[PDB]
Amino acid sequence: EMRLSKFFRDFILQRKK
């Protein structure tokens, strides 16, 4: 799994409020 990790880099990082 070397793909869809960039989707998760944009999604998880918006929950670091």
JSON list of C-alpha atoms in Angstrom, two decimals:
[
{"chain": "A", "resi": 1, "resn": "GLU", "atom": "CA", "xyz": [0.00, 0.00, 0.00]},
{"chain": "A", "resi": 2, "resn": "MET", "atom": "CA", "xyz": [1.94, 3.01, -1.40]},
{"chain": "A", "resi": 3, "resn": "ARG", "atom": "CA", "xyz": [-1.21, 4.79, -2.73]},
{"chain": "A", "resi": 4, "resn": "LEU", "atom": "CA", "xyz": [-4.21, 6.59, -1.06]},
{"chain": "A", "resi": 5, "resn": "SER", "atom": "CA", "xyz": [-1.78, 7.70, 1.74]},
{"chain": "A", "resi": 6, "resn": "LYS", "atom": "CA", "xyz": [-1.80, 11.26, 0.23]},
{"chain": "A", "resi": 7, "resn": "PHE", "atom": "CA", "xyz": [-5.64, 11.32, 0.67]},
{"chain": "A", "resi": 8, "resn": "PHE", "atom": "CA", "xyz": [-5.09, 10.47, 4.26]},
{"chain": "A", "resi": 9, "resn": "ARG", "atom": "CA", "xyz": [-2.43, 13.06, 4.62]},
{"chain": "A", "resi": 10, "resn": "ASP", "atom": "CA", "xyz": [-4.99, 15.71, 3.68]},
{"chain": "A", "resi": 11, "resn": "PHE", "atom": "CA", "xyz": [-7.87, 14.21, 5.73]},
{"chain": "A", "resi": 12, "resn": "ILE", "atom": "CA", "xyz": [-6.16, 13.34, 9.07]},
{"chain": "A", "resi": 13, "resn": "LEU", "atom": "CA", "xyz": [-4.29, 16.64, 9.16]},
{"chain": "A", "resi": 14, "resn": "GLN", "atom": "CA", "xyz": [-7.55, 18.70, 9.19]},
{"chain": "A", "resi": 15, "resn": "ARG", "atom": "CA", "xyz": [-8.48, 16.99, 12.56]},
{"chain": "A", "resi": 16, "resn": "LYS", "atom": "CA", "xyz": [-5.39, 18.43, 14.33]},
{"chain": "A", "resi": 17, "resn": "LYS", "atom": "CA", "xyz": [-7.28, 21.53, 15.50]}
]
